Amino acid sequence: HKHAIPANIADRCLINPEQYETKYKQSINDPDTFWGEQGKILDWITPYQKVKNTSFAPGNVSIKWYEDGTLNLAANCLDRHLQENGDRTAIIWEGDDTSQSKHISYRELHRDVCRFANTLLDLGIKKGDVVAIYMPMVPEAAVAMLACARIGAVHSVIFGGFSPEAVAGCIIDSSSRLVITADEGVRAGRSIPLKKNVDDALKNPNVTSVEHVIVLKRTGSDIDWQEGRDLWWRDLIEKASPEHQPEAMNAEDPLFILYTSGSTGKPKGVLHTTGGYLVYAATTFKYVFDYHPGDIYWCTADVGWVTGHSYLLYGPLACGATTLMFEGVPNWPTPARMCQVVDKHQVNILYTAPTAIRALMAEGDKAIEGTDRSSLRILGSVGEPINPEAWEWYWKKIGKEKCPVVDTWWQTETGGFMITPLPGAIELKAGSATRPFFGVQPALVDNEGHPQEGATEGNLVITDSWPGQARTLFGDHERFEQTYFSTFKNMYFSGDGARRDEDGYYWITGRVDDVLNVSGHRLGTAEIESALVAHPKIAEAAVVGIPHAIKGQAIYAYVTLNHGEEPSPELYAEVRNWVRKEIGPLATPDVLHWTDSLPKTRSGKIMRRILRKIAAGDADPGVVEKLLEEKQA
Numbered sequence: 001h002k003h004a005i006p007a008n009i010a011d012r013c014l015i016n017p018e019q020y021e022t023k024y025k026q027s028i029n030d031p032d033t034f035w036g037e038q039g040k041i042l043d044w045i046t047p048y049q050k051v052k053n054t055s056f057a058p059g060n061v062s063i064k065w066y067e068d069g070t071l072n073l074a075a076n077c078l079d080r081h082l083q084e085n086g087d088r089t090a091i092i093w094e095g096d097d098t099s100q101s102k103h104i105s106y107r108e109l110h111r112d113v114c115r116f117a118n119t120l121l122d123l124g125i126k127k128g129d130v131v132a133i134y135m136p137m138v139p140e141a142a143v144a145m146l147a148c149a150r151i152g153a154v155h156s157v158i159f160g161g162f163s164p165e166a167v168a169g170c171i172i173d174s175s176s177r178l179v180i181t182a183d184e185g186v187r188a189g190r191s192i193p194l195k196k197n198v199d200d201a202l203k204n205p206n207v208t209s210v211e212h213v214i215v216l217k218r219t220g221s222d223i224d225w226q227e228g229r230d231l232w233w234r235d236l237i238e239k240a241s242p243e244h245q246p247e248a249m250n251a252e253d254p255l256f257i258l259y260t261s262g263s264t265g266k267p268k269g270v271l272h273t274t275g276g277y278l279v280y281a282a283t284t285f286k287y288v289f290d291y292h293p294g295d296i297y298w299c300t301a302d303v304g305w306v307t308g309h310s311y312l313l314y315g316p317l318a319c320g321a322t323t324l325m326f327e328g329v330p331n332w333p334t335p336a337r338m339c340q341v342v343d344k345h346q347v348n349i350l351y352t353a354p355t356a357i358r359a360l361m362a363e364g365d366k367a368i369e370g371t372d373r374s375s376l377r378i379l380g381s382v383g384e385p386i387n388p389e390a391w392e393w394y395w396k397k398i399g400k401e402k403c404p405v406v407d408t409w410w411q412t413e414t415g416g417f418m419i420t421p422l423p424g425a426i427e428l429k430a431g432s433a434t435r436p437f438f439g440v441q442p443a444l445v446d447n448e449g450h451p452q453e454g455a456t457e458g459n460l461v462i463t464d465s466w467p468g469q470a471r472t473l474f475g476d477h478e479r480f481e482q483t484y485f486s487t488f489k490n491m492y493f494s495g496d497g498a499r500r501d502e503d504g505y506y507w508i509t510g511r512v513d514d515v516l517n518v519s520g521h522r523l524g525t526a527e528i529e530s531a532l533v534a535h536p537k538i539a540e541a542a543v544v545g546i547p548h549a550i551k552g553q554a555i556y557a558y559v560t561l562n563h564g565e566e567p568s569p570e571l572y573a574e575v576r577n578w579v580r581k582e583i584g585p586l587a588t589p590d591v592l593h594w595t596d597s598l599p600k601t602r603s604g605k606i607m608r609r610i611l612r613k614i615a616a617g618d619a620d621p622g623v624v625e626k627l628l629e630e631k632q633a
Ligand SMILES: CC(C)(COP(=O)(O)OP(=O)(O)OC[C@H]1O[C@@H](n2cnc3c(N)ncnc32)[C@H](O)[C@@H]1OP(=O)(O)O)[C@@H](O)C(=O)NCCC(=O)NCCS
Pocket: 159, 160, 161, 162, 185, 187, 192, 300, 301, 302, 305, 306, 307, 308, 329, 330, 331, 352, 353, 354, 355, 356, 359, 382, 383, 384, 519, 520, 521, 585, 586
């Protein structure tokens, strides 16, 4: 069953079926001309000459786009929209408590970004310095990000759910000189400590780069204060000049870093530069959401994730759209909250995650009870696979069967949408990301690297670069080359598996490496295992994900305790909290299976294939029977 393109969308779409085909073909056959023209979606201070200059060569990966051009991301997201749309709302902020909200015009946002840019400069921050941002979903988070970009300071945003230990890990790696946070974040009626977490992270003896902590008073809760080091947001910004001229940044100047979980090791800092990234974010946002001036757009993704960077802030603001930043959760106070927000602000485009969709779907009609939803024209899905059932429920209950759903597949490392439908150009299949975006050349290869043609399945790779591609891993280009370009020579390996049907539509099935999808969040099994083994009483651990009807995968941890230790309610709680302390609550194991029978190879390597099956229910071969019986209990 394929959903046809509705007449209302066909009548106003920026790209129709024929135009998609033509543009895609040119983007592949002649990227220099295609992207040379499309790059004009942004204002450049000095024009670029060279467009595409990339190589996926083994151990010699180099990616550059519009390299000789200069620009400023903040000028593109703010300044250039002032003359004609200064009074237009740039950000609609909806608080956790619906009684709280703000409408921030482009002019107001520009003013605050200018004041905060000067605040950073006066504090000593210069182009190239890394600034850690550990903020909740409040407008100030966007102000800080845009201000860093404006002066060329590389921001390192850290999701508020990261534990103090995880926060320290990011700061140590990036040598951030400044941390911008809030006393507390507000979510689902609860206050989440943030400042206290920063205090604890800074006590780590390995953190030596941080000289100041700017704190926003969001809740006014009693927090510890270190005079001199800590500074109040309000005190600083109110003393800064609202006058700031944007300086030109090179297309390849670093813009931001996002720590992302991988198959092995702890999170690495995926680095994005400026030019190609912004061109790609603005282009994908505009065409995939079919953005028209005046449209009210709402991405539910947290600012701490790449989706928040590209589609909550940068892509939309670059295009002059009104973007909505929601402080809370889709189902608080009630499951109808998301749709109530849609009605309250007359949202025209809604972009959310399958886990959220499934959580609302579990409440049936209570998710739409008392809501209208008529303002919606476009729906979107991101972050993980979505089954036909959830897709249809979303399409019917939320979209009232009138809105195309754009299921966008991409990753932190890709900067923007990679395989996605365009509302007025591609007919939809529930659960399918469909076709590649302009400039994207996907392929499916077997474990040997052989490309598979026609209707088939295999490892998902991208055979050439695209403007928004991550350029490296902070401080470790060698690891960047090995992680993404060594498995299949001359190709970018996504780590995902996928199938392509008879029509050429892609269906992303999920990670084929040891990366999990927990509630729409990317987590490495290795990092959870390392966290567990760090505990004084744990000798070894094997972590696998198991299917979960709501969050996609639940975390199942097989744990071997040292001799002298025994399981107990206390230890069960201590171990679960230990992971929460080492990484954060998102990585807390849902199940702890105590065992001394971990399956291993004769070389001593643990075999997770067998553990994966057992947890789902599906050197010493005797461990299998033992594990099975322990699992039964
Ligand atoms: C459906 C959903 C709202 C459910 O939220 P939930 O009921 O809090 O459950 P989660 O699994 O997200 O959270 C589990 C833990 O993380 C914590 N947590 C979640 N988000 C947090 C945040 N922004 N800051 C701090 N802590 C957070 C919770 O407090 C909880 O910890 P606790 O039990 O110790 O209090 C949520 O999982 C979601 O939005 N998922 C989709 C992710 C997404 O947008 N993906 C697209 C790619 S970004």
